[PDB]
């Protein structure tokens, strides 16, 4: 996938290691990193303007 793009990388707080943590309760993670919950108990990190789940 080229640069200048978005990367998709597939408990109350879920942390990302290489960055941020996503709070599912109030659903809170500017715009560089985002956390999306495509399913139930499934999280994917999205990185705009181009990794471990903890």
């Amino acid at each position: 996938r080229p640069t200048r793009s978005s990367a998709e990388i597939t408990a109350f707080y879920i942390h990302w290691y290489l960055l941020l943590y996503y709070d599912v309760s109030n659903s809170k993670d500017p715009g560089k990193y985002y956390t999306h919950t495509p399913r139930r108990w499934s999280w994917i990190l999205i990185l705009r303007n181009l990794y471990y789940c903890a």
Partner: T-cell receptor, first 124, second 107 residues
Framework: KVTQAQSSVSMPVRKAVTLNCLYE???????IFWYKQLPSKEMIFLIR?????QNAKSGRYSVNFKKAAKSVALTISALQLEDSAKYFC????????????????????????FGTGIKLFVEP | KSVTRPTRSSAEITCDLT??????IHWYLHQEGKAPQRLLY??????????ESGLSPGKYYTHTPRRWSWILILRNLIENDSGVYYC?????????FGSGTTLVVTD
């Protein structure tokens, strides 16, 4: 702002129905778009009528644009059965570079302001 | 064309806008009784989200799954968030609209 006061108008097939849409604007030059939202919710573009253009026509579709009255009402002539939809009068300023606020937006970031729509029933 | 998601969840809106040279992708919400209204537009080149005034960040996100592809993501869904969502991009004679997906938010 767009004001479509009348909704759910009914007209027979083969007649002509005029959908009255108004607008409120502070733009020197602008365009008014007539879309139809199908039952599949597929918003289909029908006609484009500029503020500084002659009353637009697209075959069956026509516009009776009144710049001073801000009446850009659409008219559909010789309706067929597959004409019933929710007709939206939308005020936008896409291809306009002068006459809007001092924002640095490049008109590709400009929103198409919609009226609440008018459903048209094509009775037989 | 339909996306059913519970409250306090995340919903995705993908659409068939095949525009290649698009620079901005607007996301309109038609709530079936009001006018179709923009929630945001996505600056494709700089990849930014411009929300309408009075909103809060993180309510809406625009994802780029592929090259010329966009998805509107809603966090902490509420019932008011239900409606129809369109991806709209300005075209030369008009504003092209996606097929539009209905997001219904269940209890």
């Amino acid at each position: 702002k767009v004001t479509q006061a009348q909704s759910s108008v009914s007209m027979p097939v083969r007649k002509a129905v005029t959908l009255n849409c108004l607008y409120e604007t502070s733009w020197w030059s602008y365009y008014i778009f007539w879309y139809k939202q199908l039952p599949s919710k597929e918003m289909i573009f029908l006609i484009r009528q500029g503020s500084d253009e002659q009353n637009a026509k697209s075959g069956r579709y026509s516009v009776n644009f009144k710049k001073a009255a801000k009446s850009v009402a659409l008219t559909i002539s010789a309706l067929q059965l597959e004409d019933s939809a929710k007709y939206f009068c939308a005020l936008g300023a896409p291809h306009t570079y002068w006459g809007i606020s001092t924002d640095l937006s490049s008109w590709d970031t400009r929103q198409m302001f919609f009226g609440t729509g008018i459903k048209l029933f094509v009775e037989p | 064309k339909s996306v059913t998601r519970p409250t306090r969840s995340s919903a995705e809106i993908t659409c068939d806008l095949t525009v290649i040279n698009a620079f901005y992708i607007h996301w309109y919400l038609h709530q079936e009784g009001k006018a179709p209204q923009r929630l945001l537009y996505y600056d494709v080149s700089n990849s930014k989200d411009v929300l309408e005034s009075g909103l809060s960040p993180g309510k809406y996100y625009t994802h780029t799954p592929r090259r010329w592809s966009w998805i509107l993501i809603l966090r902490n869904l509420i019932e008011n968030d239900s409606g129809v969502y369109y991806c709209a991009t300005w075209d030369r004679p008009s504003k092209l609209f996606g097929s539009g997906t209905t997001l219904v938010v269940t209890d």
